[PDB]
Amino acid sequence: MNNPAIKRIGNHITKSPEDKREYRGLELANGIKVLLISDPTTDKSSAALDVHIGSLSDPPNIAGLSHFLQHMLFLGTKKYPKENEYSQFLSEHAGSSNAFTSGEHTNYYFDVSHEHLEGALDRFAQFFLSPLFDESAKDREVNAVDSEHEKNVMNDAWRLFQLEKATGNPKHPFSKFGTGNKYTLETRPNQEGIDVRQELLKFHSAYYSSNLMAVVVLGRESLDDLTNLVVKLFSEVENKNVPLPEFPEHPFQEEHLKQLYKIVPIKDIRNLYVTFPIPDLQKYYKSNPGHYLGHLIGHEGPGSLLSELKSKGWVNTLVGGQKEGARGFMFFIINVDLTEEGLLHVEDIILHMFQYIQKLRAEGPQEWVFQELKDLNAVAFRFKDKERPRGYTSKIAGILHYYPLEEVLTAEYLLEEFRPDLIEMVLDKLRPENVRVAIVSKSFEGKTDRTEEWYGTQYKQEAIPDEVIKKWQNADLNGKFKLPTKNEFIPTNFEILPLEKEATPYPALIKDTAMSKLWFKQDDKFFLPKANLNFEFFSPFAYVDPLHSNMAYLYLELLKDSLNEYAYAAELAGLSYDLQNTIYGMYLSVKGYNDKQPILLKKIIEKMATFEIDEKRFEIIKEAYMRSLNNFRAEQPHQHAMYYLRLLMTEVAWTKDELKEALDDVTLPRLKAFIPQLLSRLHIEALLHGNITKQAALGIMQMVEDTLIEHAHTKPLLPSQLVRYREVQLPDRGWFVYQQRNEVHNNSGIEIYYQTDMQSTSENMFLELFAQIISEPAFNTLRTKEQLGYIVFSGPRRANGIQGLRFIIQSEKPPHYLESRVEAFLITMEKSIEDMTEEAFQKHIQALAIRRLDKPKKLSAESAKYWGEIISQQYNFDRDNTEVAYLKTLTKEDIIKFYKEMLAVDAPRRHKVSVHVLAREMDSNLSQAPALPQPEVIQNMTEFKRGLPLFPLVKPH
Numbered sequence: 001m002n003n004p005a006i007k008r009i010g011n012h013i014t015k016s017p018e019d020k021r022e023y024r025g026l027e028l029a030n031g032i033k034v035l036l037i038s039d040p041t042t043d044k045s046s047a048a049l050d051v052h053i054g055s056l057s058d059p060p061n062i063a064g065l066s067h068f069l070q071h072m073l074f075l076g077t078k079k080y081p082k083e084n085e086y087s088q089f090l091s092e093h094a095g096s097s098n099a100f101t102s103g104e105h106t107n108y109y110f111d112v113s114h115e116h117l118e119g120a121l122d123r124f125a126q127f128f129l130s131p132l133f134d135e136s137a138k139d140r141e142v143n144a145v146d147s148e149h150e151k152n153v154m155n156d157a158w159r160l161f162q163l164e165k166a167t168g169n170p171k172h173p174f175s176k177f178g179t180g181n182k183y184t185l186e187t188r189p190n191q192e193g194i195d196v197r198q199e200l201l202k203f204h205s206a207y208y209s210s211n212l213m214a215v216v217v218l219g220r221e222s223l224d225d226l227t228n229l230v231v232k233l234f235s236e237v238e239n240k241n242v243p244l245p246e247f248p249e250h251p252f253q254e255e256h257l258k259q260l261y262k263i264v265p266i267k268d269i270r271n272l273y274v275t276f277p278i279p280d281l282q283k284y285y286k287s288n289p290g291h292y293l294g295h296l297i298g299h300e301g302p303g304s305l306l307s308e309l310k311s312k313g314w315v316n317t318l319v320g321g322q323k324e325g326a327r328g329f330m331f332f333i334i335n336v337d338l339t340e341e342g343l344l345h346v347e348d349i350i351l352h353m354f355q356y357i358q359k360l361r362a363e364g365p366q367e368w369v370f371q372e373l374k375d376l377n378a379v380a381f382r383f384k385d386k387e388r389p390r391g392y393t394s395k396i397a398g399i400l401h402y403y404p405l406e407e408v409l410t411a412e413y414l415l416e417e418f419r420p421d422l423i424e425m426v427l428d429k430l431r432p433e434n435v436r437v438a439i440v441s442k443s444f445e446g447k448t449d450r451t452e453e454w455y456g457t458q459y460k461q462e463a464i465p466d467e468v469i470k471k472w473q474n475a476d477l478n479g480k481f482k483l484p485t486k487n488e489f490i491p492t493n494f495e496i497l498p499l500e501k502e503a504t505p506y507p508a509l510i511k512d513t514a515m516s517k518l519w520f521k522q523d524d525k526f527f528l529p530k531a532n533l534n535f536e537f538f539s540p541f542a543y544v545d546p547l548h549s550n551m552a553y554l555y556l557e558l559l560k561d562s563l564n565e566y567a568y569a570a571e572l573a574g575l576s577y578d579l580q581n582t583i584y585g586m587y588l589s590v591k592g593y594n595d596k597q598p599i600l601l602k603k604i605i606e607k608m609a610t611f612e613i614d615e616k617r618f619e620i621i622k623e624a625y626m627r628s629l630n631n632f633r634a635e636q637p638h639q640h641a642m643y644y645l646r647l648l649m650t651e652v653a654w655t656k657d658e659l660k661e662a663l664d665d666v667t668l669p670r671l672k673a674f675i676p677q678l679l680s681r682l683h684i685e686a687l688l689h690g691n692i693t694k695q696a697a698l699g700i701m702q703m704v705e706d707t708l709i710e711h712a713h714t715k716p717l718l719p720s721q722l723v724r725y726r727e728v729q730l731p732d733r734g735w736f737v738y739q740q741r742n743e744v745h746n747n748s749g750i751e752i753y754y755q756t757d758m759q760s761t762s763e764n765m766f767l768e769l770f771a772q773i774i775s776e777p778a779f780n781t782l783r784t785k786e787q788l789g790y791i792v793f794s795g796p797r798r799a800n801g802i803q804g805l806r807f808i809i810q811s812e813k814p815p816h817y818l819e820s821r822v823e824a825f826l827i828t829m830e831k832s833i834e835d836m837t838e839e840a841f842q843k844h845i846q847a848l849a850i851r852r853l854d855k856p857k858k859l860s861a862e863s864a865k866y867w868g869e870i871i872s873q874q875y876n877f878d879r880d881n882t883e884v885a886y887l888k889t890l891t892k893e894d895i896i897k898f899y900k901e902m903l904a905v906d907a908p909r910r911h912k913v914s915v916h917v918l919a920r921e922m923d924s925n926l927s928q929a930p931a932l933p934q935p936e937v938i939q940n941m942t943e944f945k946r947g948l949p950l951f952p953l954v955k956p957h
């Protein structure tokens, strides 16, 4: 019978009957809540742990101490003391790992190839028993956290997030600064005689208690096997018995209500943030009052709040509902963006907001609205897509802290109790008497008197004038507002059509005309009543010039905007659509339950081909678009660097500058005329994949075609017109540099690309294995050791069927410097491939192998792979076996010669391009950096491209 180490074993853990995985929860004797997941099919295994502490519990005098502790647990324990044993064990077993710190949680998670769960899990458990917090590790890692912060500093969503905490009761833990930085984590602690290693030990020791812990483990093993496992490694975690922190006081007290903030953004954006404090509804999770209201306020359908603000040309988008706080407090929000006009009618927008809330009081709670939500959640739950295991374990570790073992799977889905009282109760808190208002606009530039300490946000604070409050308190009904009616998009037909006699393991080309290639597969794997239908429409007029490119965009935005009201129902019924312009024309994906898919598709194509612009909206979207083109100048440095490289290496690319200038030439008449033009000749390549038949698929594709013919007069396009763009071919021994300044951010950015050959079976596996071998050593040398940045990335590049190696770093140090530390790195690397065992080398193959052979867990992931094969026009649907088969063949020498031919500093075929993005402010013991040739500075994009060969395109299959 009984077991000393276990306190209890829960009953049946309720699951979806479609979910084949097996489950067992339990609580150890030390009080760790643990959920076990058995999946005999799984390629990777995963575990995650979540501690119920986070930054809300930092010592007041060392801000960011948990985010810091989180970074430090990866860096050596007593039992596995080598600084990077954890990240290197994973790299070599096809695993990865991350962690995050929120106000009340620290969540640690990883996956690994299924054969090394134990390996991975043992090294993992150590974090929670005896981390070393190595003194020189602490010294180094403090930079990476400073860097986490630098990137967030000029980011308008982080600033807002912290500024909110800075305008509530500063006495409250909510007002803490949870990232931390160099200043707060070493400089100041040094100044104040604080011994940080000790403070870290103390905190670990105080809060990392077993009672406050939840663990999830998903492996190939039996439930009995997993039980013994988790018991073995986790029972020695000590029970220091800490009470869980509570925060029953809202941090927004009287003095903090009826306030208005005027805030300057970094980007040119206008939004209005309306927020009421409310209690913590978490306990009401079985009826879920704030969800019911969120559904209603946030609704986008006919009759809705957004409908009206949108008609009045005041706001373009709206979000509303409950927003988490911590144990003891929540918020209820309603935030909109703001048109130019909208910015001058903020008071009116808030009235409308209250008129709408009034309409809800007048109408009472609605059992049918609650039923609808409920029915959707039961359908959603039953046919949920099966999840990637790392994400799943991370997620359930969190909610193990909120729900009885048995409801952990279903808690966030199944609604059970109708509560008109709670609905009323929450409604009665959404009142002008206790509202806070924030306006974010460039107009407040110059006229603010305040500054946020951490990010440096300029703002102004005021009381809402008392007659403004009254004016809102007296919100009449407004007849422009209605509740939503019954949702017609709700699926009722869930039948999984039987697998057909001619069904195929990969998509089959089942139609091949001048108008359209239709690739097709009935689903042989997941069996949920869902499908993905993907179309590429080709027109050469979508990207012919900058103006045409602008026009394609606008047109597709306006169509989406026109369709929103109608599409929205569909979206809540789990039928969604994506639609955007490409450098080849347009892309249209429709995913979800297949039951009403045909209807939604039809409406989209019908709308596309019969489109009637409305002057007023065109004017608003044009203006939004201009701004976002401008706002690019405020993306982080490494994004700039990637953007430039794309511009540099493609045959044809229209810069942001060129699009911006060309935008003013875009009048309503020119657009009206462009749309029929663009739809007159097309070609469609489509992937239809899911719970659908061959003849359904031909019918759906014909339907699309037939609609465009009937309404657009569309005609086929010629094969010689189906043109793909080529990548620039760099010369042997070549090295070019292109330099720009990031005017917003104070880091610099860099991308370094070593181009290699076209993609091919052998070229692919060379580059890929090289990647794998250097993957974690790069991170470990360039970040952990040399602490060059938070952002440090290396891996294959691929575009236009060509490929190469890239490095991406965001750093405080100049790029000339970044370059050489990579170049030093690359030698450490040849010279340590020489040194490695044959086994180490085979492990690497094996790891890359599992990684590539990892089976899609859900329809759209499989759809993705296929779609990848189709847009690249390689159609190599079984590439994974083929490429893997070949890879198993390679040897330490194969790799060295490849490296020596294409990569080493004095390689005969080194093709290096470097983008240097300099910081706001610049102007233009470690290994050995090789002396580098003087680069050719790229003066002018066009000229440089005029001066070089273009590669071929790759050949199909």
Ligand SMILES: COC(=O)[C@H](Cc1cnc[nH]1)NC(=O)CN(CCc1ccccc1)CC(=O)O
Binding pocket: 291, 294, 295, 296, 298, 299, 300, 318, 319, 320, 321, 322, 323, 324
């Ligand atoms: C569940 O209720 C609803 O249907 C509507 C959806 C909607 C609103 N407007 C169009 N659609 N509500 C939400 O989406 C609410 N949302 C806001 C929380 C939030 C957290 C951190 C930062 C900013 C915002 C919750 C989320 O992010 O899951």
Ligand SMILES: [Zn+2]
Binding pocket: 067, 099, 100, 148
């Ligand atoms: Zn972090």
